[PDB]
Every structure is written in structure tokens, then in C-alpha cells.
Amino acid sequence: SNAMDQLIAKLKKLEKQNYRAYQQIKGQYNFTDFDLFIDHIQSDPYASASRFRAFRAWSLTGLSWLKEESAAFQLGARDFIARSFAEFAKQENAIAISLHGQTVLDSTSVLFTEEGIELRFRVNLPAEGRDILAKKAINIITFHLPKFIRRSTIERELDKEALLTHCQVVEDQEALREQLEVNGLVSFVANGSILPRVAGNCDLPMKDAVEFTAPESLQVTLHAPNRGYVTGLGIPKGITLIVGGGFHGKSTLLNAIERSIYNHIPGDGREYIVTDGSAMKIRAEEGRCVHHLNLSNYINHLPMGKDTADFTTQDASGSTSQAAWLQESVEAGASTLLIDEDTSATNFMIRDERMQALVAKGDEPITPLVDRIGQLRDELEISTIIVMGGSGDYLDVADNVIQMHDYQALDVTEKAKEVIQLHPTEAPLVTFPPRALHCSALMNILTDGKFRVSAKGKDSLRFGKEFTDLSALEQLESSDEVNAIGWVWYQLAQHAGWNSNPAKQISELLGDAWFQNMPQHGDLAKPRPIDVMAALNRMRKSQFRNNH
Amino acid sequence: SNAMDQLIAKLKKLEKQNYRAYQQIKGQYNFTDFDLFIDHIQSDPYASASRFRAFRAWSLTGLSWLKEESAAFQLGARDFIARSFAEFAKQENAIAISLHGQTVLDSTSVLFTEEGIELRFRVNLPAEGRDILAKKAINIITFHLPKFIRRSTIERELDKEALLTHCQVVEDQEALREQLEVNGLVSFVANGSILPRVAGNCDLPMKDAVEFTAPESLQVTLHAPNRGYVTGLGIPKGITLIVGGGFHGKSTLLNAIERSIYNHIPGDGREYIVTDGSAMKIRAEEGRCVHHLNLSNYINHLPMGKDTADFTTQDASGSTSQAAWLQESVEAGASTLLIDEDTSATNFMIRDERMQALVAKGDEPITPLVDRIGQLRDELEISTIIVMGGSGDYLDVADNVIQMHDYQALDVTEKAKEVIQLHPTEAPLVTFPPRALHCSALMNILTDGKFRVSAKGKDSLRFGKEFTDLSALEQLESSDEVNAIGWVWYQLAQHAGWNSNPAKQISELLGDAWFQNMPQHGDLAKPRPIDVMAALNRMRKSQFRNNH
Ligand SMILES: Nc1ncnc2c1ncn2[C@@H]1O[C@H](COP(=O)(O)OP(=O)(O)NP(=O)(O)O)[C@@H](O)[C@H]1O
Ligand SMILES: Nc1ncnc2c1ncn2[C@@H]1O[C@H](COP(=O)(O)OP(=O)(O)NP(=O)(O)O)[C@@H](O)[C@H]1O
Numbered sequence A, B: 001s002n003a004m005d006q007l008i009a010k011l012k013k014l015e016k017q018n019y020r021a022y023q024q025i026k027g028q029y030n031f032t033d034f035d036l037f038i039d040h041i042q043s044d045p046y047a048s049a050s051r052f053r054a055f056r057a058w059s060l061t062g063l064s065w066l067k068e069e070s071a072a073f074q075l076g077a078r079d080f081i082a083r084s085f086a087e088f089a090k091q092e093n094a095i096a097i098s099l100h101g102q103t104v105l106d107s108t109s110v111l112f113t114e115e116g117i118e119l120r121f122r123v124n125l126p127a128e129g130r131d132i133l134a135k136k137a138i139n140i141i142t143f144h145l146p147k148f149i150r151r152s153t154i155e156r157e158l159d160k161e162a163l164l165t166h167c168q169v170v171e172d173q174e175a176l177r178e179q180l181e182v183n184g185l186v187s188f189v190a191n192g193s194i195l196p197r198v199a200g201n202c203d204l205p206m207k208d209a210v211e212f213t214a215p216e217s218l219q220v221t222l223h224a225p226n227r228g229y230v231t232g233l234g235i236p237k238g239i240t241l242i243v244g245g246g247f248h249g250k251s252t253l254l255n256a257i258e259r260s261i262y263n264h265i266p267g268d269g270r271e272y273i274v275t276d277g278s279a280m281k282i283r284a285e286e287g288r289c290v291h292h293l294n295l296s297n298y299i300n301h302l303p304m305g306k307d308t309a310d311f312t313t314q315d316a317s318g319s320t321s322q323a324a325w326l327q328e329s330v331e332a333g334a335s336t337l338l339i340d341e342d343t344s345a346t347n348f349m350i351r352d353e354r355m356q357a358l359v360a361k362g363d364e365p366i367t368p369l370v371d372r373i374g375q376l377r378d379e380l381e382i383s384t385i386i387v388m389g390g391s392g393d394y395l396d397v398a399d400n401v402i403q404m405h406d407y408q409a410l411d412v413t414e415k416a417k418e419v420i421q422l423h424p425t426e427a428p429l430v431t432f433p434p435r436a437l438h439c440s441a442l443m444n445i446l447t448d449g450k451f452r453v454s455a456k457g458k459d460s461l462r463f464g465k466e467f468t469d470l471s472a473l474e475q476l477e478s479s480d481e482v483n484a485i486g487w488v489w490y491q492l493a494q495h496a497g498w499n500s501n502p503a504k505q506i507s508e509l510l511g512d513a514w515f516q517n518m519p520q521h522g523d524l525a526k527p528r529p530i531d532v533m534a535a536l537n538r539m540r541k542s543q544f545r546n547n548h
């Protein structure tokens, strides 16, 4: 109130002055119920909005009990608070907080500590073209803003019946995800789930859709602390095929699985679907770069006498890029691989005697996944789920086979084996040490690039003057995690030299207190270590080597 | 000079006034050597730059002779003039003209008429935050700009030896493209061409690359009016396969062909490669919409008892989207189809007895391209070029087979036939009337969307409140043609009602004087009729019907 009145009076003087004058507002202001922080002042009304932060001690909120709930329960609480703040702030468009659509992410928009709750958001400072409108600014910052900050962080001001439900569904999702390993499962699709979305350009669920039901033969029942027992499709470890004719729901099922690496909000249709957190969907990429990667397990020969054990390029082929992606995922410690025959290189998937008859000179044939996929399971315990409907030689090595028909799952593993007996149709899979990363070389990119670090949506990531294409990483949900990826790189750049295990280093940097070493931005979400590597594997300046 | 002095004096008065004051500059100004047009004044220094236009009669340029050259020769001249103007204007970044990288397009940045040469460009009006800097504005508009407008449109001021060469290569490209049909060819790759680019994110040519050479067995020699006789690879009509092991240059060859639908600048490496102008590369799309399209020739059965002759959706499958794309291309009159096995649905390409054994209930099997591709050639005279390296059942119906090895073409058609004899393995392809378009329904989108028409790069096109995803259309070169696509739609919206042949209508709208009915913008390039349809086929609000 006193510091607030100090700001009010200080803000009145800025009336009709140049927009540059807002720089004087920069600083901390200890209000009555909270501390207000104004970190970055935009230099233009039409530029990115000014960043603000607000802190509230647990004593004044009536939500101290949240500290004694599970980390997942608190994850939802933080998400619910951000959405509540956004809802109360609809009538004031100058205020904006970073939301994550249908998912619940570990975001910086709302953070918990031992001291209290922290809110991070933006405030588009007004003006009459360029001259400052103090009276409007006062109304936003000293009248409206304080109300949204309070209402969003006061037990009674929030809808508790909706809060508990929100936190409970997220807690259940984490609980269900933790017991996948114990039950020898890599994914779980609860009965009653709504898999299809309204359209291809929208992540919301389709209304009036055929609800999912699992075939008893492949049915499992998990237990959530709030909802209790939940029955659904249990996809066991190993190789699992998703077959069926065209337009029957194979991709829709796989899409739900690939996205179940994240938690979803209630009513989304997928909030009771969980999948191995490290599951990586691989597809064919055109034009990507690959750094000193060993592809001996898949590619045997290359033109221009290049080393298959130290493959490097700035314009990768289809089968080459997918093979590289595959190896990169193993390197990063992925337990599950997702593949869709409709978005992959046929050459890389299957073998063919036809082609090998006329291309049998000095070009040794590539080793297709079908020959290695079995070894990935038996040797590395890596599961794989594949949408097919085209080839059939995979049916032999598959553990389970699911058929989609009129948008319902059917267990056809038994009949699948019968087809092989009626009509029937090798080298050791080598594990390699991870490539070392030149952590200090990243600093050079920042210096030459003015320490620029930002994301343009989900597809691109700018690190200095370098732009990284992340289009292929379709599992990514928000640009917030892309920004976070860039700020992880920024931290890697602070280290002395080379690191012989980057994935491990990245994992340790994001060790629960992942946000403390990043700038205090409100548009950041914890990214997966495997995704940081994936993005880094596609950065054209990245320096990797082989301690071999 | 008099009208210029009028502007100068009129511009001085605007010193230190609000940026809004620039609106008074709007209008025409008859300078000494040209007429200056200031069409749209930006409302913010940080918003899209103000649009300008300049006109110069042929008498004052010394380039009247260009009017007696071929349309293609003039196409290059217009391109060369735009690049010259950009070069002279490097020291003045406030000025900008729309260039098209490595291609030569029919653009609005530089237009010819019977009266004279017209230049269209932007001018970022300066200010000290918001207050107008007249002195700077004067320097840009009355001192620098007039010099670039003159120098770029005066025979002696330009580099003639470079001008002629530029216009000659383009003229040769058109000449070579026109004699493809006569020699029963769909594409021509001249010997000495450089196909690979520096990288996947750059369209410039790779230096120190293995130059292309055609195998005599499949060699042809065309004739250009300037360069004379040129020998290279002649890809005849019908089905042509591009095989070989991984990382040998199959996509690079196909990529050069798909992009040869446009003319390229000298030294680009592809300026002597031509391909059927209507060639459409089809691939698998996820989530696209499809409007009342007949897929009877490919899809036989669908769930939920849907009509295969009137297929409609807002979230299309892989094989479904590719099949739809295929049919849509035939509808639009495409003579050549480009396919890459690494970016396509395997299910859609090949047949398989394996899968049909366990998915043989009420789901009739989809008819794969391999069964129809032959009919497309024999019945519709539609050629197809396919990069394979995976499947081998296509070798049977193929006319010619090219093998890439160490980045050189080899004719393996003879050996390809031998492989089939040693190991060997139907319904009529129906032609349909084109879908009618509800031209007037487009007007409704404009009214509800504030007549908004713009493109965000090459990937997106905004028409009112509707956003169209054009990512799959990888053949597109510039956002200028995407803008042009939107302005064609704008014209379709002016018509009374339904049109039973939209492709024909679009073709007639772009009849050489394509730019006269579009706003006088400088960032527009003539798009292909097939591309306008392609974009329109993916607009979720488009209304198509079947007069059947
Ligand atoms: N349970 C369901 N209820 C209603 N509609 C559904 C359901 N599942 C899928 N759909 C819709 O039906 C269509 C099926 O498409 P998709 O799931 O891509 O089939 P698909 O041919 O198996 N894909 P692919 O993996 O590329 O072969 C989509 O438009 C979905 O939105
Ligand atoms: N003539 C050439 N000289 C030098 N380098 C080349 C040449 N042609 C291609 N390359 C390069 O070699 C690599 C070959 O990649 P690509 O052309 O995709 O092979 P591919 O495996 O046939 N592609 P796909 O069609 O997906 O199977 C690319 O990085 C090219 O840049």
C-alpha cells in the first residue's frame, strides 16, 4: 500500500512522456499482500510485452497444505492457478500468462517454493501511439493486476471442487505412469478414452466419437489414488504392431500414445492415457544435419568412401536420417520407439530381394529395422510400437498385434501367427559409447550471435545467429519448452570443455530445480533431456566427437 | 522536379510531428524522369513498410527493344532489373524490393506494359521513436530513391553483358521447356548440371560436387536459341523409376526435377534443367481436410458406411490423404506426378498378401498405386517419376529405370527386366467430372474476416479468419505466389455462384494480364493454377460439390 502509493505517484509523472520513460518503473515494489517485480520493460508497444513477476507467501494464501501433497498434485495446482489467473484476466487483455492448451506442464508461469507461490506473466504497457498513458497504466498495474494476483492465489477465491479434481487427475496420471514399469507395460489406454481430435489443426477432443475399449485378451487394470481402479488397454513391453485397413484409426491411437508422454487436463479425452516418458517417435527427415554418429548397425556402406562409424553431413537422406534418429534415441536412453509406416522410409523398414538383385555391385545393402528391431528388444530391452497396414514381414518378430476396425481395438496376435506358418519368408547389435559434446563451442555461437536465445513457435529455435529446425519433433507441445531447450544450451555453454555424456549432464541440469539457473521468464516449461539432445543433434554448428 | 520540390517543401512541414502525419504524403508525384506513387502508408515504424510504385516510359530508358523479345526474354529482363535495383539500394536499407532467390518468377516487383516499366517496392519511413524525421525521409525519397529508380532502368547504367546473359538463359529455359512435349519428354537434365544444394536449409548449389552426366542409352540433345545444342538426360513420358542404395543421390535428382518447374538464375546449377510445368509432387499428409472428392479408383471401402465416391473429412489419414492428393492432381490436369517412397504411405504404394490375410472381413483392400499407375499412363497419358529403393513390384510396369551410384545416373532398364523374368509375382480407371466450387461462399469468409488476405511465409495463407496450411506443397518457391493465391481467391469470390470447372476459371484469370485485377502490391508472383487449387483443396471452409 505504501510502496504501491509510491509507485502510483511515481507513475503519474510519466504522463504524456516518451515511451522510453517506462524504464524508470523497473524494479521491485512491496505491496501489501505481495511483492511485485517488473523485470523487462518493452521498448515498443508493438514489441514483446513487458515481463512481470509476483510473489505471495503461503501464510496469506490458505494453500500451505499443497506443500504436503505429491509433486504431481502440486503440478496440477500450479497449472490450475495459471488458468484461473488467465480467466480472471480476460477482461484485461494487456495482461497475459503463458498457458499450455490441453496439457499440464512443469512451467515457470506458476512456481512453488518453500517461501510461497510465484507468478510470472507479461503486461503490455499502453500509450497513445508513443506517449505514455499513465492513468491507463495505473488502472492495469495498481487496480486490476493486484486483484488477479490475489484471487488466483486464495483458496476461497478459487473453485475448490474444480481445483481438487484438477490436481487429482494429474496425480492419477503420474501414479499410473509410475506403475507401467512394474506391470511390464510401456503405455496404457484407459477404457472410455476419446482419442480422435476435432480436426488435424486442433488438439481438442472430437465430440460424439466412438469411445475406446480394450480387448479382454490384452486388458489390464491399474490403480489411481483418487479415481481408484481403472481398466483399459495395456500395451506390454517388446514389439507391438497396430494394423488394419485405411481410415480405421491407427494413427489416432498412436498419436494419443505419443502425446501421452505429457499429462492432459480433465475432459480432454486422454487424461487417463499414460506412456513411457522417454518414448520417441521417429520419422524420415529431409535435409537435416547429423554429427559424427555411428550408424554401423544400420548403414553398412557409403559412397565417397565415408566412414559408417563416424557419419557426418549437412543434408541427410531419408533412410539415413531415420537411421541416425534411431541411433540418437538409443544414445539418449529412450525405452520406447514410435513409428508410423505412413511417415517413414520404406527402404529403412523392409527388406526386398527384388531391389538387391540389380543393386548388388559395390553397394552393400542397408540393414532394415525389421532385422534390428528384434535385437533392440532382446538386447537393449527397448520396446517399439509400429502402425503398419502395408508390409507384413514384421508380423514374425512382433509380440502383440492390434487391429483397428471401425475405431475399436481387436487382439489379432493369434491369427497373426497362423498367417506366418502358412507362408514363411542376424549380425550382432553393437552398443557404442555416447558422443562427447563440445560444451564450450556453444559459447562461441552466443558471442558471435549477441547472446540471442528465443523460439519462433514449436518449429524453430534461435541460438545466436543459428536457427534450428524442430519440425520433425512433432511430440513437442509448447514453444515454452523450446525456449527452455535454448536456455539449457546456454548453461551447457558455461562449462570448461568437452563432456563425455551430454544426456546425463542435461538430465542433472533439469534436476527438479531446473528453473533456478535460467532467466526469470514466465514462458518456460521443463523439456525432456532426450528432446534437448534431439534439438542439439539438429543444430548445424554443434560439435560432437567419438572417443573412439 | 517541380512536383518533387512541391513534395520536399510539403515534407519539411511534417518534421517532429506525430507519425500519423505521413498519411498526408499519400498520392501521386510526377517527377522529371518518372511518376512516383505512394499507395499505402504504414501506421507504425515497426509494422510492414509503406508501399511505393514508380513508372518510367520506354522513351527515357533506352530499353524499348525488349518489347520485341520473347516473353521469356522479357521475364529475365524484369528479374534482372529487380535484382539491379536491390543491389543499388543495399546502402539504403529503408528501401526494399521483393526478390525470389535462385528462381526467376513472373513477379509484380517489376512489370512491363506498352507505356513503360513499372517498379513496385517498399520504403520503411523513419522516425525518432514516433516523431517524424522529415530530413531523413527527404534524403531517402527525394535523393536516394530517385537514383535507384533511374539506374535500374537505364540501358547504360545496367551491366548489359550481364543483362543479355541473364535474359538469354531464361529464354533458353523456356525454349527447352516448350520442346519437351515434341520429343516425348517430361523432364530434361542437361549434362554439367549441379544438382545438390549446399545444405538442406539452403537453395544455393554445392561447390565441388560431382557434375551430372547422362547415360548414352537415355541421352537426348535439345536446342536453345542462345546456347545452341545442349546434351543431357531425357526423361521420356510414362513411368520412370529412380533406384539405388541409400545416400546415392535419388532425392537430389528428384528435387532438381520438382523444382525445375520454375526457371533458375545463371550459375545456380539447375538453369538448364526443365520439367513439365504442371508436375505435382505428392506425399502423405496428416490432418488435412478433403472436400467431396471421389476416391473410388483407389479407396474401395470406408468405415461408418461412408461414400468412397463423395469422400469428405477434416482430419485425413496417410493413404487417404495421398490418394486424395492424387485424384485432385488429375482433376486439375497434371501431366506428371512426382513421388518419393521415403515421404509416402507404404500401404498406398504397394500390395501385400500378408496383411490381406488377417484384415479380410468387411474391409475391402485399398487399391495401391502400382495397380493404377499403369492405367494413368495408358489411359490418361500421365507420366510418373518415382524414387524407390525399397519395393520392387513397380519394376514390372516401369518404362525406364535409372540407378544412382556415387552420384551418377546409370540406365538399368535392361537388367531390371531380367530380374522380373527370373522371379515374377485390373479394374477400369474411371474419369470423373470436376467438382464444382461455390465461388460466392468465399465472399462470406472475407466479410466475416474483414477482407484480410496475407501469407505468413510459404507454409501459411490467411483468407479472412481462416488459415490454410501449405507445408506439404514443398514445390512452392516464394511467399509472393502464396499472396497471389490469396488474391486469386479474392477474385473467385466476386462471381455469382457455383462454377463447374474451377481449374479452367483460375487458368483464365491468370491469363498473362493476371496482375491487373489484383491490388497493386509489389510482393506478388504468378502462381500455377494447380497450386491455387491445391491450396483451395486444403482450405477447411471451401465448398465443393458433385454434379453427380
Ligand atoms: N474412436 C473414434 N471415433 C470416431 N472417429 C475416429 C475414432 N478414431 C479415429 N477417428 C477418426 O477417423 C479418421 C481415421 O484416421 P486415422 O486414425 O489416420 O486412420 P489410419 O488410416 O489408421 N491412419 P495411418 O496410421 O496414417 O494409416 C480420423 O479422421 C479420425 O479423426
Ligand atoms: N552429384 C553430387 N555430387 C556431390 N554430392 C551429391 C551429389 N548428389 C547428391 N549429393 C549429396 O549426397 C547426399 C545424397 O542424399 P540423397 O540425394 O537424399 O540420397 P538418397 O538416399 O537417394 N535420398 P532418398 O530419395 O530419400 O532415398 C546429399 O547430402 C547430397 O547433398
Ligand code: NA
Binding pocket: A245, A246, A247, A342, B317, B318, B319, B320, B347
Ligand atoms: Na491410412
Ligand code: NA
Binding pocket: A317, A318, A319, A320, A347, B245, B246, B247, B342
Ligand atoms: Na535414402
